[PDB]
Write a protein that binds this ligand. Sequence first.
Ligand SMILES: N[C@H](CCC[C@H](N)C(=O)O)C(=O)O
Ligand SMILES: [Ca+2]
Ligand SMILES: [Zn+2]
Ligand SMILES: [Zn+2]
Ligand SMILES: [Zn+2]
Ligand SMILES: [Zn+2]
Ligand SMILES: [Zn+2]
Ligand SMILES: [Zn+2]
Ligand SMILES: [Zn+2]
Length: 417
Amino acid sequence: MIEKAPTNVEDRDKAPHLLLLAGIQGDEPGGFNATNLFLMHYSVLKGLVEVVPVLNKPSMLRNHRGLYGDMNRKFAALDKNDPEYPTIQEIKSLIAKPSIDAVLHLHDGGGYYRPVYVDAMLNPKRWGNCFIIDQDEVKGAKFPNLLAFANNTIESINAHLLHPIEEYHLKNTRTAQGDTEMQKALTFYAINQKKSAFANEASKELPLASRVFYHLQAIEGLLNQLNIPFKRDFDLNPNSVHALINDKNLWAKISSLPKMPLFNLRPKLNHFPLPHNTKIPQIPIESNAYIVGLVKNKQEVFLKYGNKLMTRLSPFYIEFDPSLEEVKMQIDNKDQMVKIGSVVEVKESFYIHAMDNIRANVIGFSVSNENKPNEAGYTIKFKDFQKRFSLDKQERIYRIEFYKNNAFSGMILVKFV
Ligand SMILES: N[C@H](CCC[C@H](N)C(=O)O)C(=O)O
Ligand SMILES: [Ca+2]
Ligand SMILES: [Zn+2]
Ligand SMILES: [Zn+2]
Ligand SMILES: [Zn+2]
Ligand SMILES: [Zn+2]
Ligand SMILES: [Zn+2]
Ligand SMILES: [Zn+2]
Ligand SMILES: [Zn+2]
């Protein structure tokens, strides 16, 4: 759970409080790319929006809906030995908090919903491009009139239509009065705790940038009805949405290793160091996005950005000695100290100074065939590199690794501008 709040605490009580959820199935990327882009490029000026950007992370990592069955069918009867029993108990705690007024759950669904039959793709049994409620009202809620909030939200979405077929409509499922599937579902538990709950569906038949465009129009619409004010730093059209999701300024950081670009990496990275006696889900990880992770696949380890594969790691396990903090280096004529885990920019040349009990291996450069080398003490230029060992496709980024006895001591990266 991540909060999105005003930079000054005084404003938190000044507007209502929304709970925003997505990723309860791992194969619905419109939903969790939208929660991600909201977290990165928007600001909430009054009130609060709490976000769980992906509820079932093990499944998002395996591009699979469910893994332990459906998570959106486990809010009623549930055996105490079920594997996700602890996780739904926590989600139930989040919904039931006093300070939460409203809930929005984001989905991607098949076809295009219509309130009457038209053909196989367009009918009341489909889920795509609609906005959803359990009941027309909820006696006891702060905002009890579900039906009106929905209709004004839909009006807003339709003023910005790309093409005529994507038009939005309302869908009421009348949950308390018949169908037993929605009785086991998330929003029905939420109205039983007297909260106003909603769902948005975008059609699985659209390219990713269009699905996200509509998930963002829906959020922008609902926040307007609740009077939670906001600001974004970009123009909302499909071309601009495509350019923020595929942004060349995105990064990820594994354990104590340095920051790496997300896009334009090589497909496979070899002899990549990782800590021993530590199961893969326990290895720390960081990014300027909220949907990044690691997952074990036979012998390799995969780096994921939502459902996109960004590179395959071929690892090797070794103790991580934390003793070494910094290293001395010359860059474009000037001597300086550089901390373990940095990135540095070079126009012409660099040089590494030697150390006690520490060994250094510049990956892509070599001076002999001895397989545990020490390449401290050489003046090195761009033309001295074997370009195939670069970390990127543009052939400008290279690794430097440090060792002591049988232990890994740290990494640094160089970038040729
Ligand atoms: N395709 C979805 C519809 C979303 C239902 C909504 N009430 C929620 O789960 O919050 C499903 O079959 O569950
Ligand atoms: Ca080397
Ligand atoms: Zn921005
Ligand atoms: Zn049992
Ligand atoms: Zn779904
Ligand atoms: Zn219509
Ligand atoms: Zn795209
Ligand atoms: Zn392999
Ligand atoms: Zn020296």
